[PDB]
Symmetry: D2
Amino acid sequence: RVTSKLVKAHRAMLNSVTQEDLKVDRLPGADYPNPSKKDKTDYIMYNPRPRDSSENPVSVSPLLCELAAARSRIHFNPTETTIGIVTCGGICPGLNDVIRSITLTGINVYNVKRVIGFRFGYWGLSKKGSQTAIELHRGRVTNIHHYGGTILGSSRGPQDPKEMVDTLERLGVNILFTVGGDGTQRGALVISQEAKRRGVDISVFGVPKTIDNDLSFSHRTFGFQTAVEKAVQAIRAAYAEAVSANYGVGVVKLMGRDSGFIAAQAAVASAQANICLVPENPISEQEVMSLLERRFCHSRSCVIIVAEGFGQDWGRYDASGNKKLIDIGVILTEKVKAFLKANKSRYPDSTVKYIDPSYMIRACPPSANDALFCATLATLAVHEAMAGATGCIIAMRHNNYILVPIKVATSVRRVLDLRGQLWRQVREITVDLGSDVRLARKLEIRRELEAINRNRDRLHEE
Amino acid sequence: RVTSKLVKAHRAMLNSVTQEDLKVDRLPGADYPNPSKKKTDYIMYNPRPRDENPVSVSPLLCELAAARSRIHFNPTETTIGIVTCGGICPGLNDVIRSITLTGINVYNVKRVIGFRFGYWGLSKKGSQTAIELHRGRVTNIHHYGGTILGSSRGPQDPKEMVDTLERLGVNILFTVGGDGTQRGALVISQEAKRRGVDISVFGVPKTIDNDLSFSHRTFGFQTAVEKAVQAIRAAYAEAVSANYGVGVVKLMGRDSGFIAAQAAVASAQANICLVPENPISEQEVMSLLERRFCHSRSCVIIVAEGFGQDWGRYDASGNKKLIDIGVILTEKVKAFLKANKSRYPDSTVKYIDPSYMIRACPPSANDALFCATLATLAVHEAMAGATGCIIAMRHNNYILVPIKVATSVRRVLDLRGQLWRQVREITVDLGSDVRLARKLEIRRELEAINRNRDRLHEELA
Amino acid sequence: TSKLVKAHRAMLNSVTQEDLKVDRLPGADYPNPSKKKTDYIMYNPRPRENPVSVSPLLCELAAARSRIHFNPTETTIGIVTCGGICPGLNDVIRSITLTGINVYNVKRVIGFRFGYWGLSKKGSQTAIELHRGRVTNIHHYGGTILGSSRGPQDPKEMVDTLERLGVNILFTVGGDGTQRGALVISQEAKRRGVDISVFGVPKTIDNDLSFSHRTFGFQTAVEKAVQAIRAAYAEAVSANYGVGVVKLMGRDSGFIAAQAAVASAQANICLVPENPISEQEVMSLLERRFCHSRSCVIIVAEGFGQDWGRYDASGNKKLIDIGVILTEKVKAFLKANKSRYPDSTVKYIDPSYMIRACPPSANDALFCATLATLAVHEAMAGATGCIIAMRHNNYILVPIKVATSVRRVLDLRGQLWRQVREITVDLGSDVRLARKLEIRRELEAINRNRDRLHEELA
Amino acid sequence: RVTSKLVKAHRAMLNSVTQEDLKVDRLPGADYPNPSKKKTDYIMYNPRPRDENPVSVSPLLCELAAARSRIHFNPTETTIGIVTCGGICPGLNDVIRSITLTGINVYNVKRVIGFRFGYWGLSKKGSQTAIELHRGRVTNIHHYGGTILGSSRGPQDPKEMVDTLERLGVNILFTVGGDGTQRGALVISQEAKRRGVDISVFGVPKTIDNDLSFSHRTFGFQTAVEKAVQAIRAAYAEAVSANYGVGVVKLMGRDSGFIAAQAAVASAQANICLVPENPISEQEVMSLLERRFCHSRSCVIIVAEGFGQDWGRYDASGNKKLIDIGVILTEKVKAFLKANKSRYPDSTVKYIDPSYMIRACPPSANDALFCATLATLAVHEAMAGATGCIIAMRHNNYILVPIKVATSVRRVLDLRGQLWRQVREITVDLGSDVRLARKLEIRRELEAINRNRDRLHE
Ligand SMILES: Nc1ncnc2c1ncn2[C@@H]1O[C@H](COP(=O)(O)OP(=O)(O)OP(=O)(O)O)[C@@H](O)[C@H]1O
Ligand SMILES: Nc1ncnc2c1ncn2[C@@H]1O[C@H](COP(=O)(O)OP(=O)(O)OP(=O)(O)O)[C@@H](O)[C@H]1O
Ligand SMILES: Nc1ncnc2c1ncn2[C@@H]1O[C@H](COP(=O)(O)OP(=O)(O)OP(=O)(O)O)[C@@H](O)[C@H]1O
Ligand SMILES: Nc1ncnc2c1ncn2[C@@H]1O[C@H](COP(=O)(O)OP(=O)(O)OP(=O)(O)O)[C@@H](O)[C@H]1O
Ligand SMILES: [Mg+2]
Ligand SMILES: [Mg+2]
Ligand SMILES: [Mg+2]
Ligand code: NA
Ligand code: NA
Ligand code: NA
Ligand code: NA
């Protein structure tokens, strides 16, 4: 009963996935030796669950994923390779660790000719933008891992692939590392394709950026654990506010656009959520109000976590073509205010406080563990691209680093499994509809009556 | 010379302040000895000399708070009550906890009562929810934000409230909260006198803004600044990540800009700092932004919540609700950058409102110590029959100050002070030739880099 | 980046599928109130038509079960925490209690004080009853509210206690020692025909448990360690020929040391037990560091350098303090070379207790709760003699005998350790040409800088 | 009745202090206008009245620090120098950064020079490593502990140092450091006078201990208290986890106990607080511990590093090295509990020395603000030719104070003050009948629980 689930992507490139789809494209040939390693691809089962010990276990699936690793032979000539980095889309903890590690691995391990950082996402690759490219060196990236955001900066909206490749050519780029999400990596493919049309010796390698941890073929993306730490700190605040008011409601919106991993993890980690609203589990304003009522039958406080992709069906694009969400944080808060107002009887006093800790989550520096994670991804990213990997992203599954072709990855998305342990834990700690309000509380205060008497004895026995 | 300034309160009770006004009311007589210690000392309101020994430029003296040899209430028979009212602020639980423990540990009082949800917990209805505070209850509450007692907005009937105080045997009510709260305390105190009730009403001032008069520091304030700065770094991260990126973050200052200002300087990251003391027009702000965007691709704008209330068009307690200047300013800045898509090709505005995260978060270690000291001294003085007053801190000393005085004046930024002078230094300036200013910038830079270039050549071999 | 190795006191010399099978109290007649056969996962997902594991081993997946062995409303759960302290003990304690009380509505939960001592005839008088009100907020605190202890107790006394108190499940939270004790307790309870599950929640801040990629507390330890490293780094940078030496937890392995070294980006030398080197080699690395820098940060795991010189109540071998010894050797070295290093300072940081006695990261908390929750599920379903663990992002059940027979260790050929090699001083570099190719990288950079800024004026 | 007290310094330069002593030396003349501001004000040393307007109980006035209309140095031609000496303390980089920026932004000075590794950077040899500080260099340093300039211990030749100041064109040297540092400053200032050099020597006081006279707060101090408290929680966690567990944590206080005391109260967790102001014997400490162990299974002992120096038997600068009381106290406590295995069956002592983590960690937001203000004012006054003095803060105001006065007295805990009175409250007390004290404890408890029991029945 695992806690994630796969699902077709809103804009899938493949409708089915086969082993060939999973094979990673490589620039032709690998003639130089690896200074790092002063001999062939290893794989890992996509799914380690067996069919049919006995004679050796056979996977319930035919799929293998390529393991990322440093390689004996590499494709590019180390001391002559130029590496490029761009960061696109929203910001997320660990961008600067990615930037820094790519640079240092290039410079320290492979002793590359130069590292170029492109400004403000793909815009920095445009004819106009290219004038702002900077050269990244040890001194530039030494301390950037202490800061949120991206020193390169980022942007939204497309650029002309022909301009971008023009730029890559003019500057002598051999590897462009594209750090960003779904949009970014789709752009990567376009760039990669245009370079091919030209017969340019260029790897385009993706480092996946999604604070939501909704990437397919992945159990963890950088930034995500940090977002959970911060979200929990948001939740404590909301909890403080609710407890301080008779019929107090703390509503806090968390990141989840298409999935509720942050919302769920934070709900359980904090032990403080009473209602947890995720996109996987669309419910009506009436149900929410109903859960709130139940909560207010036995408590004077209620914390409601809501993922930003929840309740999009509750009412009525950006430069990149992404569908703008309606702010469910604001809308839900208003509906809850409405509800408690229309019931001034039952709830004499009552307060609703709303917290949107969005930017503080995304624009804050990485946890130590996220840093380590970023550095590992980035390091391996450089290893594989040096060995001519292209058209793929690096990811992590089953505690292993793998290579995955952009087409596969952008075709499916990870989603909460409502039958999973994580979501089962959210159901445990939150208010429940399916409980006789009466007997439920009756079996509460009795659990209490017991406890206090055990208490009373123990202390007399003093 | 100060970074603060005094100003008449929006609803002042005194129009002038005299020594007699500063005298603290005391329940008649002090017959019991102080178990803790098994006449009143003063401090000059103003330590600046006029014109042999220096003479204050002012006649005012303030009474120093301290544990007293003789006390008014009979320790082992006194009942203490605590209520928290108004908004929440870091340190409420440390206050609650310290009052309780000082009462219980030092004076060995009969009982401590905590009243729920502000003054509502003193109403006939509310009183049913009063709880008894004991060591076990308050042991660990200092680790949490908010108030375990809870708080509320809106008035109660002083006759009901005193009824409650009488029925429960309360000898001291500690009222923890703001201007409103302390005004309510006077009412309560007055009604208790009309009845000849032996009751002290003592205020522990609660203002996250640090805008209390006769005070240089109120609990929660330093914690607010730590948190604000953290908010500012986020806004700065967002701005730096975007070509012509603007991070707008709203901070607490309702009638004053101390938090805004301190956080601006502490962070080193603010480009524009908007406070109520210094009302400027949308056009001026846009103008400062333009100047910032002449030499930088990023701008962080701090705005206090009481700024720009004159830029456009009540709560249960009668407080005037503010228009959200964070939201309005953000929109105006969006409007401005949109209407200038030419000059600024790309451009982004991100708004952060860290309000509840600041107010509902636990105290720094230093705030905790501060809370405990205030609360401790509060118990000392009220045991010694002080009433109608608050405890406060001036010139590194704890003083007693009558509610009437304190609610008549408020502390405000002095724009001629060092703090504000530092805000002027670090932020964009209007009165600089945009051109020659940047010219003398990149030249400072050209220098630097060449010093750099030499140093590193002087490195090889 | 890990590797398996025989345990210092192994119970099995080889591991077979049958060894991996988890013992279950006979029969499962009651329904699970929570859910108003066993699934497995390959021990090794590398392949040798559908892929075939390079290994025959399967591990049992932990999960809530349709049928359970104990009668929920009549089961009594007990908890004990033993050995050293580690971040997340209270989360474990709290989650076991709440899962028992909320999900299974068990009769009662008992907390035993000060490790196994609380199960002794004497100790048992101090047992307390855990209820929602008791555990509500303990996850905010380091340490263990139950307390812990070192040293054995009489298994007959302990089982006496379990019987007298009506315990149906004892959760033993702790390390290798603890779980070995658990088997003893479990065995004695069988000799008596007692209906008792003894289930282990593994506690090792080192992350050196076999059949496991992550144990609770570990990620928190790394956060804290990195904070220690920054301090050391601050101290080194503030002194001409400054050395910051900071000791980290690793007794038999170097996972914390290594992860913290890379996470911080600040370690110049990283000393782990997997890679024993001589005082002379360390001094040599330091010299190379001091050829191109005025600062050096040295991370050393506590199990390093035990061979550099000459027991506790539980029988554990006490280590010599390598932190103190190494610091002294480094002082000696820099003193004996006052010539080359005019000034020079050594500051030593031992952040040990601050690491172990501090509250869990949010992620660790989630992790603790999940482990504890599943632990309750499986023990309700009569699992015993085993621990819960996590491999390949999955929770599994593993018999104490297997787990205590092997240990996880750094693989020096792995990515983690390869990253430590990258960021740290290297022996095998021509000191000269290495620095020559340094300042040249620099000369370049500055000139790029100098142009960019000239191209700035006007 | 305050919480500090004054005391003669171990190496006082004045035996009495008069108003003339308090007057701040100024380089002759002030002819240039202040670009910032496009006579001296004072404050009473003591605001308590004697006996119409109140008269100070003291004749002393202190000069208020402020930006001045006229300044002494020609702004666009002044060269500023910065050195940091002595131990490290949170806020050094904020000081460095603010001096630089105030110089560069406000006064538009010619150049800012940072000297490396304390006074050594001013020696003939050291001077070769001087670096030029500019906006780009100091932009982000406030995020780091330590000092980018670095520091050192041990004297240099004043003639060399002034040679350096002259050769480089320094008009103001800002000396950031302690007592030793500022004494060095006077020497440097004196030698420059002998030469008729136009040089201000201005001190920014550095003492993490908050024991500076004429001062209520020095930078770093509040940050130290935050960190110390965090150390204390760890020790508390360790003590609570062990039957008769003792957490001993050593804090910074060399000659005073402000950090120890503040941290003891702030944490609410200390049972015993040992400061230098209150020397007690091993027997008394052991005795307080016994009392603690009469009603509790845990004890946290805070000890300041200058405590217990009389309990047993120099550095490059001539400072007296302390015996490690942390280590010695821990041992004595171990001895004591060992020799009483009877009364305390089990028992553990865990010792935490969070020293470097406190000193080498970045400033709280409030400390940063403080550092920047001090530094800013420092630059204002030195531009207006103040010299031979330090900037300090008393009664929420910034004042100028001559090094001679400041190095002659030191701030010390007042055992009759509120702070120390609070330490007495929260800690174990000797002067309580062990028996009736606990009797009146559990009775307070018996009450409480019954109030509890009713409430919950209701
Ligand atoms: N299908 C596509 N083809 C070419 N370019 C694209 C495509 N989709 C997105 N891009 C470009 O890639 C960049 C980033 O895309 P987008 O704004 O969707 O961010 P993302 O990488 O999906 O991250 P996030 O999930 O934070 O939005 C933008 O320049 C966008 O215009
Ligand atoms: N003048 C007054 N007389 C009697 N009661 C008052 C008065 N002003 C306010 N109160 C009551 O005291 C309580 C607190 O008032 P208010 O909500 O203004 O808090 P405050 O102390 O101003 O703190 P904050 O700064 O958070 O607003 C409310 O219940 C309010 O109705
Ligand atoms: N082989 C064994 N048989 C029975 N009991 C044991 C055995 N080994 C250890 N124990 C007991 O289990 C308890 C905990 O053991 P120990 O102190 O070694 O902790 P641990 O689980 O190893 O944790 P840590 O990793 O902190 O050492 C002790 O009381 C010890 O006496
Ligand atoms: N009396 C003195 N005359 C001249 N120089 C001195 C004197 N005392 C100390 N110094 C020098 O000043 C520098 C710092 O002095 P010291 O090491 O005593 O630290 P400090 O400033 O008192 O700081 P801390 O409080 O951290 O010890 C050293 O170079 C030292 O040699
Ligand atoms: Mg997208
Ligand atoms: Mg062991
Ligand atoms: Mg000294
Ligand atoms: Na409540
Ligand atoms: Na300005
Ligand atoms: Na150094
Ligand atoms: Na190495």
